[PDB]
Ligand binder design. Structure first.
Ligand SMILES: [Mg+2]
Ligand SMILES: [Mg+2]
Lengths: 74, 75
């Protein structure tokens, strides 16, 4: 791991933002959603993005988020 | 599609394809859904899906951009 940030929320949902380096030396982004169940177990949902797709992934996320931000401020 | 505000599909040169969706719940709140569909060596498609709700959108965006900035500066 090169970078790792844990984003708690006020609910039982926590997000992890991880940057890791592979063997070829390439970087990848890993976004994780971890949700606590009433039993104290965790469900985790994990997405990976290769550095070669980073600009396009970022542009696409920003566009989708922008829709929500506009609605919220609307 | 009723309940879907926004939907985009992103092919890559890898076995990973992405979907960025904005959905609307019963109350009219918007929420984000990010999906990675990964083709396995065998031909089965695994699907990974994350949801982010309105109350966490700004912080999620900020944290996502901060991690991406790490990659930007390290290339
Ligand atoms: Mg919490
Ligand atoms: Mg492909």
């Amino acid at each position: 791991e090169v970078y790792s940030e844990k984003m708690f929320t006020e609910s039982e949902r926590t997000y992890f933002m991880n940057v890791k380096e592979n063997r070829k030396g390439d970087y990848f982004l890993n976004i994780v959603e971890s949700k606590r169940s009433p039993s104290g177990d965790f469900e985790r949902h994990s997405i990976f993005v290769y550095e070669e797709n980073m600009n396009e992934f970022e542009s696409n996320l920003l566009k989708a988020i922008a829709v929500i931000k506009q609605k919220v401020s609307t």
